[PDB]
C-alpha cells in the first residue's frame, strides 16, 4: 500500500507521504489503477480540494526509506475537513498520531479492511524530529537559529548542528503548548504544557479583529503596534525599574492599557492583532525559559505550526529567550517544524 | 503629621492611614484645624469623592505602632484620579512605593515642603506582609487556605499559621504578575514575573464584553461557561490523554474554540468573561507552580487586588495548584492582600 504517516491535531491534519522513485518495469505493471491514481493525484497537484496544501518547498528528495528510494512529501489540511478526506478514501495500514487518531478512530474504520495503528504523539514527535535532522534537508541543516538576535541590523538565520542532540527542550506550539525534555533517543518526558498557544492567538485575534485566517491575523499583526494595547514598565514607573533590571519597554500587563475606555476606542485592529501575537509569544518563551532552567537544558527548540510563515514570532522568541536568559538559552527552529509527528508515525510502519 | 503609607500602582493607589486613638487633652489642643479636618474626613466617610473607598472590614483596631495606639485604615482609589488627590492636598513626610512613587514624584512635590521618600515596592510588600501577619487580623489569622479544594461539597476557607514564614513564594497579582522568593526577613528576590495579570483580565474582558468595571467583569464571569470558548483535551482526544495523565476537562487551548466562526457567533459575553478569567488564573497558577518547583518552596501565597472580591479565581487557584502539583504545593491567601506595599511604606516612617 502507499506509505503514509498522519498526525491528526486539534486544528490541522499533517500527512507525510513517501513517493517511490525506483519503481521497476514489473512493479509498474503489478500496480492497481487506484494506487496509480492516488500517486499521480498527490504528485501532480499542489492544492487538494479547497483546503489541502502540499508544502512543496519541504519535500525531501531521493530519500532512502525502508530499503526504497523516493521523495518524502508534506501535506496539510484542516481537521474540520477530515470527513471529506475519509469520504475520498471510501471512493492500507495507516499509522496515525495526534489526539484525532483516538477521536476519529471509528471514522477511519469505515474504510473497509483499513488497519489503523494509533501511535503516541510525543513519541512520534521525537522520532520524526531526530530522523529528519539526521537525514538533513536535502543536504542543508534542518535546524537553525537567529544569530545576533538582539541587533536588528545583524539578526539573521544561521544553521545549527544537532548531531549530538541531547539534552533538548522541545516546545511544541500547536493549538496549545506541550513542553518535552529529551535526554536520549529513548528517554524523554512531557515536562508540562500551557493553554496559551496557537489556538489562543487565532481565536482571540478573530474575536478582536474579525480576521478569518491565520495568515490574515499575521498580516494584521505585522502592521500593528502592540504598545497601544499593552501597559509597559515605563507606563507604570516612567522609565526602567532599575532595582530588578526591568527595562522600560518590557510589557508589565498585556492588554493592560485596554482598561481605559478612551484607549479601547483608539486602538486599531492591527494593534490588537500584534498585542495578541506578542502576548502569546512572550508567554511561550517565558514558560520555555522556566522549564529549561528547571530541567537544566540550555537548547530550546520550537516546533508546531504556530510558527509557520511567522517570522515575527520566531524573531520575538529568539530575542526574548536570549535577552531574558542573559544569553544562557538559545532559541532553535526546524524547517519541518509542523510535520515531525506525521513523520514519526510513518516511521512506525515496519512494526506492523 | 498624619502617618500614611502609599503604594501607587499602575491601576490603583493604596493608602494605609494610622488613626491615633490615644490623643490626650493637651494633644487635641495643639492640633491644627487642617489636621483635625483630615482626620474627621477620613474617619467619618467611607466613600471619598466619586472613586475613593475605605475598606472598613479590613481595619486593624487598637494597634500599637511607633509607641502610639490607634486604628490602621485601608483606603484605595484609581491611579487615574491621583491628580484629584494631589489637588486636594494643595488645598508631612510621605513614604511612597509602587511605580508611581517614581512616575509622579514631581507631582507630589507640588505640595509645598512635602518630603517624598520613595521605597522599593517588593521591599515594602515583604515588610508589610510579615508585619500584618505578625500583629494578626484583630486576633484572627491573616492567612488562610481552602481546605479540600478538590471537593466542592467540602471546600472551605480555613486559617493557616505563618509564624515561621520562611521560605515563601509570594505571587503579586496586580496589573501584571511579580513572583518573589522570600527566604528570610532580609533575604528575598524577584524570581520572575508574567505580563498576564489583572490588567489583562480587565482589559481583554472589556474588549470582548464591553464591561465597564472589574466588578461587572466578575459578575459576567460568574454566569459564563468558559468551555464554550476554550478547546479542552476531550475536544482533541475525545476523552482523557491517559499517556500523560491529562484529564479530558483540562484546557488544551484557551479561546481555542473561537477559531470557528459559528462558535464565535454563539458564545455569550458571560462565556467570554469566564474564559478570560480562567485563562489568566490558570496561567498565574502554572507559572507559580514552575517557580515553586525551581525555588524548592512549597508554600505559595497570592496577593494583589486581582483577587479582591474574586472567590472564583481564589478557588480556581486553590484547586489548580493542588491538582497540578499532585498535592505538593498549597495555595495561600491573605485578608489584606492588596495593601501590603502601602503598609510596608508606612513602616519606613521612622527611618526619616
Ligand atoms: N493554515 C492554518 N490554519 C490554521 N492554523 C494555522 C495555519 N497555519 C498555521 N496555523 C497555526 O498553527 C496552529 C496549529 O499548529 P499545529 O502544530 O498543526 O497544531 P495541532 O496539531 O493541529 N493542535 P494540537 O492537537 O494541540 O497538537 C494554529 O493554532 C495556528 O496558530
Ligand atoms: N476597583 C478596581 N478597579 C480596578 N481594578 C481592580 C479593582 N478591584 C480589583 N481590581 C483588579 O486588581 C488589579 C490591580 O491590582 P493591584 O494590586 O492594585 O495592582 P497595581 O498595584 O495597581 N498594579 P502594579 O503597578 O502592576 O503593581 C486590576 O488589574 C484588576 O484586575
Ligand atoms: N523567552 C522568553 C521570555 C519572554 C518574556 C519574559 N518576561 C519575564 C519578565 N517579565 C515581567 O516580569 C513582567 C512584569 C510584571 C509586573 C511588573 C510590575 C510593575 C512592576 C513588571 C514586569 F516587567 C515580562 C515577561 N521572560 N522570558
Ligand atoms: N496552579 C496551577 C496550574 C494550572 C494549570 C496548569 N496546566 C498545565 C497542564 N496543562 C497543559 O498541558 C495544557 C495542554 C496543552 C496542550 C495539549 C495537547 C493536546 C495534547 C494538552 C494540554 F492539556 C494545562 C495548564 N498547571 N498548573
Ligand atoms: Mg499537534
Ligand atoms: Mg502593585
From Swiss-Prot, chains A, B:
Catalytic residues (UniProt): 121
Mutagenesis or variant effect for residue 178 to V: Retains 30% of wild-type activity. Refractory to inhibition by acetyl-CoA. Exhibits a 10-fold increase in the Km for pantothenate
The protein's annotated pathway: Cofactor biosynthesis; coenzyme A biosynthesis; CoA from (R)-pantothenate: step 1/5
Outcome when changing residue 9 to V: Loss of catalytic activity
Coiled-coil stretches: none
GO cellular component assignments: cytosol; nucleus
Catalytic activity: (R)-pantothenate + ATP = (R)-4'-phosphopantothenate + ADP + H(+)
Annotated function: Catalyzes the phosphorylation of pantothenate to generate 4'-phosphopantothenate in the first and rate-determining step of coenzyme A (CoA) synthesis.
Protein name: Pantothenate kinase 3
Organism: Homo sapiens
Gene: PANK3
Amino acid at each position: 500500500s502507499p506509505w503514509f504517516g498522519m498526525d491528526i491535531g486539534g486544528t490541522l491534519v499533517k500527512l507525510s507521504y513517501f513517493e517511490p522513485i525506483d519503481i521497476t518495469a514489473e512493479e509498474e505493471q503489478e500496480e492497481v489503477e487506484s494506487l496509480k491514481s492516488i500517486r499521480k493525484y498527490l504528485t501532480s497537484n499542489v492544492a487538494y480540494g479547497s483546503t489541502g496544501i502540499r508544502d512543496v518547498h519541504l519535500e525531501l528528495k531521493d530519500l532512502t526509506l525502508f530499503g526504497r528510494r523516493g521523495n518524502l512529501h508534506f501535506i496539510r489540511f484542516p481537521t474540520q475537513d477530515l470527513p471529506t478526506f475519509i469520504q475520498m478514501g471510501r471512493d492500507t495500514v495507516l499509522c496515525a498520531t495526534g489526539g484525532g487518531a483516538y477521536k476519529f478512530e471509528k471514522d477511519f474504520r469505515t474504510i473497509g479492511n483499513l488497519h489503523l495503528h494509533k501511535l503516541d504523539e510525543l513519541d512520534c514527535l521525537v522520532k520524526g524530529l531526530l530522523y529528519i535532522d539526521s537525514v538533513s534537508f536535502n543536504g542543508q541543516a534542518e535546524c537553525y537559529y537567529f544569530a545576533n538576535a538582539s541587533e536588528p541590523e545583524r539578526c539573521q538565520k544561521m544553521p545549527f548542528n544537532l548531531d549530538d542532540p541531547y539534552p533538548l527542550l522541545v516546545v511544541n506550539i500547536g493549538s496549545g503548548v506541550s513542553i518535552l525534555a529529551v535526554h536520549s533517543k529513548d528517554n524523554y518526558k512531557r515536562v508540562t504544557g500551557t493553554s496559551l498557544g496557537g489556538g489562543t492567538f487565532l481565536g482571540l485575534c478573530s474575536l478582536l479583529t474579525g480576521c478569518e485566517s491565520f495568515e490574515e491575523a499575521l498580516e494584521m499583526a505585522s502592521k500593528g503596534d502592540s504598545t497601544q494595547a499593552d501597559k509597559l514598565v515605563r507606563d507604570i514607573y516612567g522609565g526602567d525599574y532599575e532595582r530588578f533590571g526591568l527595562p522600560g519597554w518590557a510589557v508589565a500587563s498585556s492588554f493592560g492599557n485596554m482598561i481605559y475606555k478612551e484607549k479601547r476606542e483608539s486602538v486599531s485592529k492591527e494593534d490588537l492583532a500584534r498585542a495578541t501575537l506578542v502576548t502569546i509569544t512572550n508567554n511561550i518563551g517565558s514558560v520555555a525559559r522556566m522549564c529549561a532552567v528547571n530541567e537544566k537544558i540550555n537548547r530550546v527548540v520550537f516546533v508546531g505550526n504556530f510558527l509557520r510563515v511567522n517570522t515575527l514570532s520566531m524573531k520575538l522568541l529568539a530575542y526574548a529567550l536570549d535577552y531574558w536568559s542573559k544569553g544562557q538559552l538559545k532559541a532553535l527552529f526546524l524547517e519541518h517544524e509542523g510535520y515531525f509527528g506525521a513523520v514519526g508515525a510513518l516511521l512506525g510502519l515496519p512494526n506492523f
